[PDB]
């Protein structure tokens, strides 16, 4: 439902 | 789906570590990042550290680095965090989430306590004391190693009017205490049994309570 | 690091009412921030997520929006299956931070609560302890104070109280408080005293007995 727009800033 | 399960309850011993772990399902595991949340009833909500499954990369919370180490693996889709030097500070409930999703968490108790019954004692009103239309009855349940330990009233019978209190750390065991009230004219009149069983200890004992003098 | 300060800390609701949850960032976090929510012995459920999205399966009576620094979650109307704490989470900047987060309950007339004292059983004591419990039943608001006295002066260490939750019937709370000490300091003293102070009163509940009595 939600994209990586979890803010997958990596670490 | 949308999911995260975590691993069992752990119990360890002060200076040893432990490793948990979180499975992901239903979503690209090396899109989002994993991360790790500690929670405690004195400390609340605190954020331990992140990681990417797709990069490696980690971020930690300054009070963990070094205390704590984060890892994912690819093929089994898991996250794993790991807690050395553990110290009673570190028992408390451990979640990992994707930020939107949670897991159900993982309860870490760090103690030396052996396992331990229960020992057991029927709460009676003051003498005299009786003065009204209900009585309250109680039962303490003291002395315990690990939980949890069912309990309940007149083989379960009595439900009404019951209030089991959460269990609480006394001197390295768990102490826990409820109370039940019904008419007057009920009790003594008719026996009254508080039931309490330790699966731990494999402990099954029964308190009749008795009026007083 | 960024502090979320949310508010209101506590929430007296009424089923079918309009709840309004804020969160207030000490800088810009850019819509990053999620809603959930968690119930006693559960874990967290999400019901927002990046300010304004709503989680799959969460039901459309719930709302977020905010911008820079101030977020809402709205509750259009309160259903029992809500009651448990709400709380904020920003994930623009590490350490993630979350909200203190706010407490609803189930509001109802103050009730005083029903208290009842128990001295130490005859089996404890032929144990060499000695504890003293008194139950403080069915009141309102969760706000409650219990202090003992032995011989008239105040013991502060041997207690320890536990609260249970919100009942689902009534609405009322109820807590245990539980003075430890042994046989042989129990039996240094008379007169145990529980006293319980809550809202619903200035003067206090008091409640006890005598050792020379039984």
Redesign the interface.
Known sequence: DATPEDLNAKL | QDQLQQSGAELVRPGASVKLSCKALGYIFTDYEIHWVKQTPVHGLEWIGGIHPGSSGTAYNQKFKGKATLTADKSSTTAFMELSSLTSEDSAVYYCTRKDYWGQGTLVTVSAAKTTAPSVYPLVPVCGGTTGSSVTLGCLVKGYFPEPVTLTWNSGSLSSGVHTFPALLQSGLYTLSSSVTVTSNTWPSQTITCNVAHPASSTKVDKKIEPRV | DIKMTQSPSSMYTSLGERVTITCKASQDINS?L?W?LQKPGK????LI??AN?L??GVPSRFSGSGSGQTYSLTISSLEYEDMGIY?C?Q??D?????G??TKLDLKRADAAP?V??????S??LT?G?A?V?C?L?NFYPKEINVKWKIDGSERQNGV?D???EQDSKDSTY???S?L?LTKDEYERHNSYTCEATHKTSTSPIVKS?NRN??
């Open positions: 990053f999620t959930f874990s967290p459920k999400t997520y990046r999205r989680m799959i709380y989470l994930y623009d590490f350490p993630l931070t979350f203190a987060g029903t009842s004292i128990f001295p130490p059983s089996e404890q144990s302890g504890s419990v139950f039943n320890l536990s609260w249970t109820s807590m245990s539980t430890t007995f009595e039984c």
